[PDB]
Amino acid sequence: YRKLGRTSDQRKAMLRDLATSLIISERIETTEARAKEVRSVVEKLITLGKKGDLASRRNAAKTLRNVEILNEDETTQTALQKLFGEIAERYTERQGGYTRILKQGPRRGDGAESVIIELV
Amino acid sequence: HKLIEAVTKSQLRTDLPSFRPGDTLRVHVRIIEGTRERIQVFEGVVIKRRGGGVSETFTVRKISSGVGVERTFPLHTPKIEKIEVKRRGKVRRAKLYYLRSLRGKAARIQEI
Amino acid sequence: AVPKRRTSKTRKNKRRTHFKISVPGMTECPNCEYKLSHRVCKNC
Amino acid sequence: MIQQETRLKVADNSGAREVLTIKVLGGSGRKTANIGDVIVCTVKNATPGGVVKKGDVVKAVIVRTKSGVRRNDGSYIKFDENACVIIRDDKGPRGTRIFGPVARELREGNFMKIVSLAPEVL
Amino acid sequence: TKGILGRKIGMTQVFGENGELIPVTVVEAKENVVLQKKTVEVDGYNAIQVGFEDKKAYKKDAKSNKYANKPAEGHAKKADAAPKRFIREFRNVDVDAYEVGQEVSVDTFVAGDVIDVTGVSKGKGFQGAIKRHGQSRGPMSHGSHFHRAPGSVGMASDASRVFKGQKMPGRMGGNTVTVQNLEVVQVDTENKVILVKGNVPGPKKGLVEIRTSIK
RNA sequence: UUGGCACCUCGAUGUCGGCUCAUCGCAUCCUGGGGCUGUAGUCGGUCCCAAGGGUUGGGCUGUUCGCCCAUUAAAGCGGUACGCGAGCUGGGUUCAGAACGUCGUGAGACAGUUCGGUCCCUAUCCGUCGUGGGCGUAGGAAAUUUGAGAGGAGCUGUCCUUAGUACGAGAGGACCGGGAUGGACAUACCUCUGGUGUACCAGUUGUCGUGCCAACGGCAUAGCUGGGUAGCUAUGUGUGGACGGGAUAAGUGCUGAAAGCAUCUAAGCAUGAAGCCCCCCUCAAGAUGAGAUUUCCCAACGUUAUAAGAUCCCUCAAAGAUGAUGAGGUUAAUAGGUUCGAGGUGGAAGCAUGGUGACAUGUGGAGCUGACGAAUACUAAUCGAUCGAAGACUUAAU
RNA sequence: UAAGGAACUCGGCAAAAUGACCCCGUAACUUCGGGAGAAGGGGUGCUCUUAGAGCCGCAGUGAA
């Protein structure tokens, strides 16, 4: 697995943040290596959400951040609730491969390869 | 992908009792060197099981004249005539290495 | 630790023989000008 | 795995209690001895009244090691301590009694009297 | 007198007749075919050419080595064989005892045969003097600023240069290695497997060459 | 070596010892071959050939040297700026402090001693170790290769038997052969024994969070602790060097004169070393002398587009600093995911039951599980672009 | 970090080990203050009952 130029604790925290951001926004732009690493995290989370049981929900709570999402009209939900609600239902009949990565090309500041990773 | 298993299947034994670490075993070991073949029993507690297939080993520990002795055996070795499960132990981990520094009463293993 | 003699123009340019960049790996966009191969338009 | 400066308990009644390895015999540049090998050692601690006194330079055969030995059948024996027995020139023990279990490997080295005297051979 | 090509699968152990433990290497040697006979008359020396592992047939716009190219397809079709992934020569065989296009089964070897196994050792990358040449470290304390460096590389005014063959950091491993006087423990006709006593060079899935020991 | 000389260096050629790393000589320490012996044997003495390999871990001292302890087949002597500080150390020695003995009226000093006392430098050229790009090799290419030449390797102990024989009053005790098995070294490898294993499992302390309980997250060296997969590994597991051939050294001869004899030599003929050339392992056609074999491809008018073949780009690992190498690119298992396994951990949560409770039992070898194995196109390897021959001449056989 | 444990080195340099609190116990020598925290030992978590009875772990000043 990639180290992403960070210590183990920092890398784990960044991967949790990226996974929660992807769950919330459904489409994020990051670097190539970060996206290739986070696809596994997010898809294992979606697997837990499809499992659906209480133990799966708590295992998912080990990884997800505690963020709130304002929905259509002033109705709130957590990222965990969205993961075990809409996202899990969207992928009931799909066996893996819930994300895709689209390359954008180098960015100005450091030449890093920008990519879009989105839920399928 | 199963070539190793296929070619080592004939090496495996099926006459082996089920046991886990912490159990007390009597291991009947063949001795062939000398002028005759005979049998020496090694009785002790299983402190370790590791590996898989024909490469699996287990380790048994006893105290002989106050000196701790450990024998490690390949699980499927022909040198072992048979194994008796004498006692079933209540333990909390797979490897009982902590027994190595314990002596006498503190080294006791509660039965099940 | 330090250059014993200065480097001539000839030796310097000899060394720079391989100091260059290459043309980007690029393909025409069939519908949406040119783009990097295996990249999305991201602007079209 | 016994080397120079390794200290071993003595498993006989020769009078030596603890010895320090001076040399591992068997060829130039040999670093390590195990069960059945012969070492040169000095007595560091000795029981009063014994034959072998503190300071004597003697020869001993290793009979127990923590590193243990591997046998031809892929099985192993390891002991909780390193111990040796002081021997004469002809491989016989200097003492009359052997304490603790000893490894079967001493049979190959023809330390037969030590084998006979030991309470257990494993 | 014999030779065959195979892939190293991995290491395991078997128990001998006396209960002795024999570490073994599982070599899978399926699909060996004689592709060409080289002779003194045509090539200047006697050898058979053996192809080991079947490849896919040629197709237009093939991008990888999985598919035979046209020269390879023609060379193999000359022997009425499928194209092969690995091709090697054996100069130690009797050229008379082989026909072009024949198979080379594992049963050519028998238990107790003494063999030489040749393969490409595992790669280690760029490695320093300590690991690559077994050199000694400098002191780790007592003020030392010399731990894993190679040390002195020459003398002085004489010779005012470093001699060829001075041992230095560099890429380590990935070299052809022959291990001599291994033994065939067992030949298993199904699964086309040869069991070789001890270990042989190379990573798992790597190609190995087995020959009757020259010595 | 101590010196003599004062020829290079005073706009600086770092001094002793050790460490790391060697390399060369032979006046040979061991091992191999041999002559003489005041060589019975076992051991020795001395001389000749021989440089292939080997040739130690400690106590004391800054030490070199040396003495000692314990080994070993042996613990050789020398050169390389008394090899090696832009490789290390800095104990000693030419630094400022201080003290003793001694000398000096003194400031101070030493055929002396004592305690303390900054070791800078990002490698341009050659050299060396690795690893790429260009062009050449009279068509282009894919693969397999010969080997001019180069590198590597080269050591040796003990035991058994012969045989308690030969030798010898005895004591003692073989040469030549046969066999077994080690030390050191080299090399490959992870099945085993172990080490590590910072995205694996579990226990646990303090504190702050997720509103509370329960269950979890953060921080405290991965907080600490017990284990541990793949990989990488030695102390672990395999293997190698005591062979065989050819020519020789010191020798040993045969035949044989010059020189009626004698004579190994002058012509001839043999025999004879761990040494030489091969035999073993590795590299190797930029071997510009650029070699060989098999297979594939074939254009027209410098250009434009192509063939075989590749690359760019992309998914990767058995490979890897980067290039390179190798597995793959939808006519697809290359990676990720998914499902199922191996191995690891060791009995999840929730609930029920027992207990005042800490907890315990059951559901249930449970739950979880990076790297390992399989299956499966769910996700990503889209489209596309670039490079790439048309085979010269002269003479001979056909 | 196996086995070993100063064999390293000018020299145990560096590191490792010790370490808090409560309770036992503590030498030569001494200027009678000291030495002395000499040395060397023991205990420690959680629950319940009124010092005992239990419960759990490899390990209870479980980290610093």
Ligand SMILES: CC[C@H]1OC(=O)[C@@](C)(F)C(=O)[C@H](C)[C@@H](O[C@@H]2O[C@H](C)C[C@H](N(C)C)[C@H]2O)[C@](C)(OC)C[C@@H](C)C(=O)[C@H](C)[C@H]2N(CCCCn3cc(-c4cccc(N)c4)nn3)C(=O)O[C@]12C
């Ligand atoms: C560590 C840096 C110093 O290097 C050194 O000290 C050494 C280790 F590099 C050094 O001693 C070299 C090797 C010396 O040269 C030798 O001189 C000998 C006489 C002869 C010899 N050869 C020819 C036989 C020469 O190679 C000498 C004279 O430096 C004193 C070089 C000359 C050019 C010199 O003076 C230079 C300029 C010297 N220096 C005075 C330091 C004077 C001592 N010092 C001062 C400081 C310091 C100052 C300020 C701040 C901090 N933190 C530290 N640290 N150390 C500096 O300020 O810097 C350096 C480079």
Ligand SMILES: [K+]
């Ligand atoms: K906590």
Ligand SMILES: [K+]
């Ligand atoms: K449960």
Ligand SMILES: [Mg+2]
């Ligand atoms: Mg990374």
Ligand SMILES: [Mg+2]
């Ligand atoms: Mg942390």
Ligand SMILES: [Mg+2]
């Ligand atoms: Mg197990």
Ligand SMILES: [Mg+2]
């Ligand atoms: Mg060292």
Ligand SMILES: [Mg+2]
């Ligand atoms: Mg350092």
Ligand SMILES: [Mg+2]
């Ligand atoms: Mg001179």
Ligand SMILES: [Mg+2]
């Ligand atoms: Mg003059």
Ligand SMILES: [Mg+2]
């Ligand atoms: Mg000068």
Ligand SMILES: [Mg+2]
């Ligand atoms: Mg100058």
Ligand SMILES: [Mg+2]
């Ligand atoms: Mg000579």
Ligand SMILES: [Mg+2]
């Ligand atoms: Mg020599």
Ligand SMILES: [Mg+2]
């Ligand atoms: Mg020598």
Ligand SMILES: [Mg+2]
């Ligand atoms: Mg010098």
